[PDB]
Swiss-Prot record, chains A, B:
Transmembrane segment boundaries: none
SUPFAM superfamilies (alphabetical): YejL-like
InterPro entries in alphabetical order: UPF0352, YejL_sf
Family: Belongs to the UPF0352 family.
Pfam families, A to Z: DUF1414 (PF07208)
Record protein name field: UPF0352 protein HI_0840
Superkingdom of this protein's organism: Bacteria
Family annotation (Gene3D superfamilies): YejL-like (1.10.3390.10)
């Protein structure tokens, strides 16, 4: 019943799969789901983040996603 | 108080509420919860909305969240 989450891609995917599948059941038109995300993001960023490192981790999260978007869109590195 | 959803503030709240519920249903730490959210956030922006524009909106929304956290600590106002 204690901490047995060894951080698995299998464990993660199961979580994200449900999150998406559940949202899919209600079937949000993107807009609403982003607002729920916004609500939750604010809630988390004001509760579960280091007080003095809030800006840093918030920038890191964003930055990492921006990079993810970059390599997502740009995936034809060699020979364009 | 302000508006949260222009369509159904009730449906929005229901989505955010059940989102927390489905999270608790799987039992995920703040780490994995953010990892799933990160994959979700990025995947949606890179599918539902214009690629070259969602990147900017991501930054704008992210910076807006930064402003929220910033001005929560900088919640000062002696002048009006």
């Amino acid at each position: 019943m204690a901490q047995h989450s060894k951080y698995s891609d299998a464990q993660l995917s199961a979580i994200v799969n449900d999150m998406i599948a559940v949202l899919e059941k209600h079937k949000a038109p993107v807009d609403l789901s982003l607002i729920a995300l916004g609500n939750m993001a604010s809630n988390l960023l004001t509760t579960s983040v280091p007080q003095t490192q809030c800006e840093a981790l918030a920038q890191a999260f964003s930055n990492s996603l921006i990079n993810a978007v970059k390599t997502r869109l740009e995936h034809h590195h060699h020979h364009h």
